[PDB]
Amino acid sequence: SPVFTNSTYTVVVEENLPAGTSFLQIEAKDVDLGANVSYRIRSPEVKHLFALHPFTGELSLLRSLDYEAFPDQEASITFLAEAFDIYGTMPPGIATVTVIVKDMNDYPPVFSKRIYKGMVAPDAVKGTPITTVYAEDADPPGMPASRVRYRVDDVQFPYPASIFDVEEDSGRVVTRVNLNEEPTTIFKLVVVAFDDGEPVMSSSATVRILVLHPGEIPRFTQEEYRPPPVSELAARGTVVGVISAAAINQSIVYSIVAGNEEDKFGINNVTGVIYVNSPLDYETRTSYVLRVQADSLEVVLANLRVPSKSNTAKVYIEIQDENDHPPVFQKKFYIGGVSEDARMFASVLRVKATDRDTGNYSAMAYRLIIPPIKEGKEGFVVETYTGLIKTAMLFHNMRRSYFKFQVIATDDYGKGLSGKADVLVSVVNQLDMQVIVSNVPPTLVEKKIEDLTEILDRYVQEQIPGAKVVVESIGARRHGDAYSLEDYSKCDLTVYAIDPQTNRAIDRNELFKFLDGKLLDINKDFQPYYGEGGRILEIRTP
Amino acid sequence: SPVFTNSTYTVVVEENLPAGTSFLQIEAKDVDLGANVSYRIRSPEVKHLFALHPFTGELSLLRSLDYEAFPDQEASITFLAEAFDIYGTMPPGIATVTVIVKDMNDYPPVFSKRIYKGMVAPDAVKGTPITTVYAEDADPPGMPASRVRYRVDDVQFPYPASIFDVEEDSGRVVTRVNLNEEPTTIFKLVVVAFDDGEPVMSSSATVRILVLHPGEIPRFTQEEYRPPPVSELAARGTVVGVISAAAINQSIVYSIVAGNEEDKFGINNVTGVIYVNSPLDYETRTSYVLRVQADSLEVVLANLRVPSKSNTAKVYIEIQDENDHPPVFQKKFYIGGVSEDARMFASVLRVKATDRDTGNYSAMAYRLIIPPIKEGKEGFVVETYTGLIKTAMLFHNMRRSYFKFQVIATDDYGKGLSGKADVLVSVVNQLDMQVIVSNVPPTLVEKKIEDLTEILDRYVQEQIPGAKVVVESIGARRHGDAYSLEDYSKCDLTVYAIDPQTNRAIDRNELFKFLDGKLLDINKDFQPYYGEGGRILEIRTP
Ligand SMILES: *[C@@H]1O[C@H](CO)[C@@H](O[C@@H]2O[C@H](CO)[C@@H](O[C@@H]3O[C@H](CO[C@H]4O[C@H](CO)[C@@H](O)[C@H](O)[C@@H]4O)[C@@H](O)[C@H](O[C@H]4O[C@H](CO)[C@@H](O)[C@H](O)[C@@H]4O)[C@@H]3O)[C@H](O)[C@H]2NC(C)=O)[C@H](O)[C@H]1NC(C)=O
Ligand SMILES: *[C@@H]1O[C@H](CO)[C@@H](O[C@@H]2O[C@H](CO)[C@@H](O[C@@H]3O[C@H](CO[C@H]4O[C@H](CO)[C@@H](O)[C@H](O)[C@@H]4O)[C@@H](O)[C@H](O[C@H]4O[C@H](CO)[C@@H](O)[C@H](O)[C@@H]4O)[C@@H]3O)[C@H](O)[C@H]2NC(C)=O)[C@H](O)[C@H]1NC(C)=O
Ligand SMILES: *[C@@H]1O[C@H](CO)[C@@H](O[C@@H]2O[C@H](CO)[C@@H](O[C@@H]3O[C@H](CO[C@H]4O[C@H](CO)[C@@H](O)[C@H](O)[C@@H]4O)[C@@H](O)[C@H](O[C@H]4O[C@H](CO)[C@@H](O)[C@H](O)[C@@H]4O)[C@@H]3O)[C@H](O)[C@H]2NC(C)=O)[C@H](O)[C@H]1NC(C)=O
Ligand SMILES: *[C@@H]1O[C@H](CO)[C@@H](O[C@@H]2O[C@H](CO)[C@@H](O[C@@H]3O[C@H](CO[C@H]4O[C@H](CO)[C@@H](O)[C@H](O)[C@@H]4O)[C@@H](O)[C@H](O[C@H]4O[C@H](CO)[C@@H](O)[C@H](O)[C@@H]4O)[C@@H]3O)[C@H](O)[C@H]2NC(C)=O)[C@H](O)[C@H]1NC(C)=O
Numbered sequence A, B: 001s002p003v004f005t006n007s008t009y010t011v012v013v014e015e016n017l018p019a020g021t022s023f024l025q026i027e028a029k030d031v032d033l034g035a036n037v038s039y040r041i042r043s044p045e046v047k048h049l050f051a052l053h054p055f056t057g058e059l060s061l062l063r064s065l066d067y068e069a070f071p072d073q074e075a076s077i078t079f080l081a082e083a084f085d086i087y088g089t090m091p092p093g094i095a096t097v098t099v100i101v102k103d104m105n106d107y108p109p110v111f112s113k114r115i116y117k118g119m120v121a122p123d124a125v126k127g128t129p130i131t132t133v134y135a136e137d138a139d140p141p142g143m144p145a146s147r148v149r150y151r152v153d154d155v156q157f158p159y160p161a162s163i164f165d166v167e168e169d170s171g172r173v174v175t176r177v178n179l180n181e182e183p184t185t186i187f188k189l190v191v192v193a194f195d196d197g198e199p200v201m202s203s204s205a206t207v208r209i210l211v212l213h214p215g216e217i218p219r220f221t222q223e224e225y226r227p228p229p230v231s232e233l234a235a236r237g238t239v240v241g242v243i244s245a246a247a248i249n250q251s252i253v254y255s256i257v258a259g260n261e262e263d264k265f266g267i268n269n270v271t272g273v274i275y276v277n278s279p280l281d282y283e284t285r286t287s288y289v290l291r292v293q294a295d296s297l298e299v300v301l302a303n304l305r306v307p308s309k310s311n312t313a314k315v316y317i318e319i320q321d322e323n324d325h326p327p328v329f330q331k332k333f334y335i336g337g338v339s340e341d342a343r344m345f346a347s348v349l350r351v352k353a354t355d356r357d358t359g360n361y362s363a364m365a366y367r368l369i370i371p372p373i374k375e376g377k378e379g380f381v382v383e384t385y386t387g388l389i390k391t392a393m394l395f396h397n398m399r400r401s402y403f404k405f406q407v408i409a410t411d412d413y414g415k416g417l418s419g420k421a422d423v424l425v426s427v428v429n430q431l432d433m434q435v436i437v438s439n440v441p442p443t444l445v446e447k448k449i450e451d452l453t454e455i456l457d458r459y460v461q462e463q464i465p466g467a468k469v470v471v472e473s474i475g476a477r478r479h480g481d482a483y484s485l486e487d488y489s490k491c492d493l494t495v496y497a498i499d500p501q502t503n504r505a506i507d508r509n510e511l512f513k514f515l516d517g518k519l520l521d522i523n524k525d526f527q528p529y530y531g532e533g534g535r536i537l538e539i540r541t542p
């Protein structure tokens, strides 16, 4: 008589476990005779899953349990078990068996990809986003056992795992510490996905973390650039030089941030050739301080500028001197006078021309264009590198004649633009000059004769508008009352003036009554160029 | 009749546990009547430790167990327990109770100090030693339960704990990752000491990690230094300038590594004053490229140099021009000649003096020291800023007389060292000169008269050792056979020479037979200074 000890059993059965595990012991006993009580289940669907020993009574697995193999309309599963005998002893017992399936991990978690990629900064702050690692569930949801959980392992790769820690719930790969490493290094970050239920099933993946590409800090060929000097006659398009910087496998974009407030130079963005954008002159500034910046391709692509000190260079562009302006004269009419007895190599006048803005020159070559002169003679010539006009030939018996010539001035020994001025040379004798007798030694007269010439010019130009005083000769005191020699320590200063209104001789009686008419002012205005000495004694006709 | 179920019990008893825990149930039963079996221990030393209920039989603690409270001569502890009754039923039972004490943590671990200090590098590599954290055991040793174990906790300080990990067995605090942080930041690293036994007892400590002190990279006041120019007359001790660099709270030690291979300059190590170590001249180099290094105090103390690019500056020291050398003359004897009829402002000679190494000058002032001259007259004077000697007075009826004067030369209009040379001036008339008749126009003679003077000097110095040819005057062709005028397009070149051996006149017949004796070579050597023209026709006495 097989009877059951208890009619209802309730056992929570773990699913997806490997076969061979025994869970429950169901026991029935024969009252009359026998310990060979046999067990049979009235459920064909769990015969594949469970295997029940018909002699001991242990319930073991033949195939691993699947909750989806059961109908989904039952949150509690109940079947029936009968018990028989070999001979067939009666009464037969009827009991109920309730199998409770625990809801946990069914399939191991599967990653979406095998290999992931990312990028980090060499100075990445705490919490920098890199990439997203996500795996599928392969699990009927609705419980915290269907939620993936991420962590790092340092038993095989301690260097990536101690630096980059994956967030627990979101799976975001952030920076746990501030890293300080070398670029172009590929790490192996093994991330193990696991759930939070019974026997944990897990897999492995690989996260390939490359840092960046170098070429971040540009290296100039020269810290301070000095091009060769460019001419002041340069126009738009003149290449004054080129700047160059080197970086590891990156393109360099150049730009000018300061130094061209007058908008004089420009640079190409992809090459670095600095060319003239507006013509430079000597009236403007002659030296510039240009600030050239060099940037990598990665910071231009990410709208940044390189945060270094060695990204700034200085360019000094100096302007050289060329031919730009024609020479100008001090006066357009240079007036001098020569005597009839004046041999060759005699000093006449000093023609001086200056450039208005050009200072390259050291000496200027002068040329003369001559009108024809009588008796087959030839006119004046001038020294080349000096400009000092000399007397060419003797001019005997020529009264009030004037020899007008033109001086051609061109800088740097002659190449380019030209200028022209007029030179008036008069011929004089004793019938047109006068002798001023002074009480001064001859040493005070000679070393400052041009200043005394200018002061006598200021004297003579007050009485008649327009005069040029030319000192012909200086001598000792020999022009007295009876033309005798009295004192060897005094002087006869022969002073002559030329009227530019007629380009001819001024009468000697006119200059006589001019210089004798203002004597009390002439004796006072002759003061500052003394040195020492006395008064002006008299003025005598030669 | 109280009898025991079993005579010997063996229970491993946990030590140092809080009181109230029950471990063993000892059971005795009365055969006749009673369930109130009472228990008494025969050990006075465990009465403080253990408390035994005389009605139920549970063994609970009254005081926590100490292994040192027991005698140390027993590795196994055994006492005796009797059992009585209220009425005193017989036979009494005798049993043995063996108490086994488990050997684990007795006292919690105690640190040696509360606060520890350390220092780290801003670029510290993996495994950099910092400090030593060590705690006492407070435990009788001889088991792995008396070994301390260190780990970090990131629940309250995630930033220090994720960066610095303490070694497990040695307690050495190393760098787990490469840190990249800011200086002067004090961290709080809580290290919890724990053993590897039963109920873990633990305490807490604090590790104060300061990084370093800044001032590592020096900042120059100028990247490129240019002192004002120093004189060439400077000696040892002249301060040409000073260099300065700034750092955060650190001292700067200066040194020169390149630029002074001739050992010209030196610098003070604690201030930066650059002074002259050897006198600089213009014969040496005029511009230097000095490389000045600035180092922090921490790298000098640790025998290092700062690993930057902005630790190098360039110093350009330029030398200005001062008075160093006296002026030298081209020749110590300048020889010229004047006529008897030579008025004032007449060109005589050009005295030229140059400095041997000084190039500051633009014009040189000359002075004359005169011997006394007859008739109350006064001697020669010279122009100040030119050096051109002019004729002072007329020299009538003076035959073969020479007027020797001395020229004083001092650069920069006169301040300092002086020089002296001799000047010989002779007086000539028509009785000592000669006339050379040539077939050349006058335009070819005047512009190159000094070169023709040098060629005539080379002519005359071949016949007599020592002569100086001075061209007195140039004229048109008027010295013929009968002293008549024939051609106005030809020249009379009056050529005169002075003998320095007597400082007097050379005879005109001597120069006549000199220049007439070598005529076929003179007509060929006169070639390169033509321009154009013909031959030399004749030589006629004036
Ligand atoms: C800027 O750009 C330049 C040029 O573009 C880069 O230079 C190249 O760098 C790559 C990467 O390192 C080189 O590619 C590899 O070269 C190896 C040759 O090894 C040499 O050097 C080692 C160490 O000194 C010697 O022992 C050896 O004998 C060689 O002399 C190859 O063996 C590699 O092939 C292997 O790897 C690849 C990729 O994994 C596989 O597909 C192959 O099948 C093989 O397994 C590889 O080709 C390249 O040679 C470099 N070029 C030059 C001209 O030097 C710079 O690196 C870059 N700058 C930075 C900072 O990255
Ligand atoms: C180095 O890099 C710099 C900066 O990147 C360059 O400067 C840029 O140059 C481009 C090319 O000219 C500019 O792009 C164009 O800008 C025009 C703006 O016109 C201004 O200037 C004119 C003349 O002074 C004024 O009359 C006018 O009012 C504006 O003030 C736009 O109108 C252009 O758009 C037209 O052309 C494009 C292309 O054909 C069409 O698609 C459009 O629909 C439209 O018809 C054009 O965008 C740019 O603006 C400049 N940037 C700056 C900041 O100024 C340098 O040129 C470069 N160096 C070299 C040598 O190339
Ligand atoms: C800006 O400034 C620079 C430098 O100051 C000027 O260059 C000078 O130009 C002048 C004029 O040409 C030079 O002066 C002359 O130099 C001659 C040297 O000749 C050289 O070149 C020729 C042709 O290549 C060669 O055949 C020869 O062998 C030489 O290598 C001298 O021989 C000249 O002297 C002669 O002429 C003068 C005047 O007529 C006479 O008085 C002399 O006795 C002699 O017969 C003359 O000195 C000068 O040398 C140049 N300087 C330099 C440093 O080269 C630029 O010209 C100026 N810019 C402009 C636009 O003009
Ligand atoms: C190079 O050397 C200079 C000078 O030696 C240093 O400058 C000093 O730095 C220290 C440390 O920071 C300063 O000391 C502290 O100053 C506090 C004043 O706080 C001011 O600033 C805050 C923030 O702007 C304002 O809110 C506030 O109102 C003040 O204006 C004091 O409050 C501090 O006292 C507290 O801390 C100490 C130490 O823990 C305790 O003992 C006190 O009881 C109190 O709790 C402290 O004194 C100092 O003031 C700075 N001096 C100057 C002149 O500025 C540089 O820091 C150094 N360079 C580097 C890189 O470190």
Ligand SMILES: *[C@@H]1O[C@H](CO)[C@@H](O[C@@H]2O[C@H](CO)[C@@H](O[C@@H]3O[C@H](CO[C@H]4O[C@H](CO)[C@@H](O)[C@H](O)[C@@H]4O)[C@@H](O)[C@H](O[C@H]4O[C@H](CO)[C@@H](O)[C@H](O)[C@@H]4O)[C@@H]3O)[C@H](O)[C@H]2NC(C)=O)[C@H](O)[C@H]1NC(C)=O
Pocket (backbone or CB within 6 Å): B267, B268, B269
């Ligand atoms: C900036 O910093 C530099 C480097 O630190 C300094 O150079 C050092 O200067 C000190 C001070 O003179 C030197 O110390 C002494 O060196 C002597 C070596 O003598 C040499 O030179 C002499 C003269 O040319 C030779 O005759 C001789 O043979 C050697 O070649 C030692 O003899 C000294 O020791 C004696 O003096 C000390 C102190 O009194 C005693 O304790 C000793 O027992 C012994 O009697 C002394 O050590 C040092 O050597 C220099 N360093 C280098 C690398 O040369 C600069 O001086 C400093 N700038 C300034 C302005 O101070």
Ligand SMILES: *[C@@H]1O[C@H](CO)[C@@H](O[C@@H]2O[C@H](CO)[C@@H](O[C@@H]3O[C@H](CO[C@H]4O[C@H](CO)[C@@H](O)[C@H](O)[C@@H]4O)[C@@H](O)[C@H](O[C@H]4O[C@H](CO)[C@@H](O)[C@H](O)[C@@H]4O)[C@@H]3O)[C@H](O)[C@H]2NC(C)=O)[C@H](O)[C@H]1NC(C)=O
Pocket (backbone or CB within 6 Å): B321, B322, B323, B360, B384, B385, B411, B412, B413, B415
């Ligand atoms: C290295 O080179 C420098 C620059 O080339 C020299 O400095 C020059 O020195 C000379 C000589 O003294 C100067 O030439 C003269 O300058 C006078 C200007 O006087 C100034 O100074 C005085 C005193 O402080 C003031 O009272 C006055 O108001 C002025 O401020 C001119 O007046 C001079 O001209 C007079 O003398 C000459 C010669 O006799 C006459 O021909 C004139 O007609 C006039 O009467 C004279 O020009 C020159 O100016 C200085 N240059 C500069 C830029 O200052 C250094 O001297 C030299 N080194 C050495 C060691 O000598």
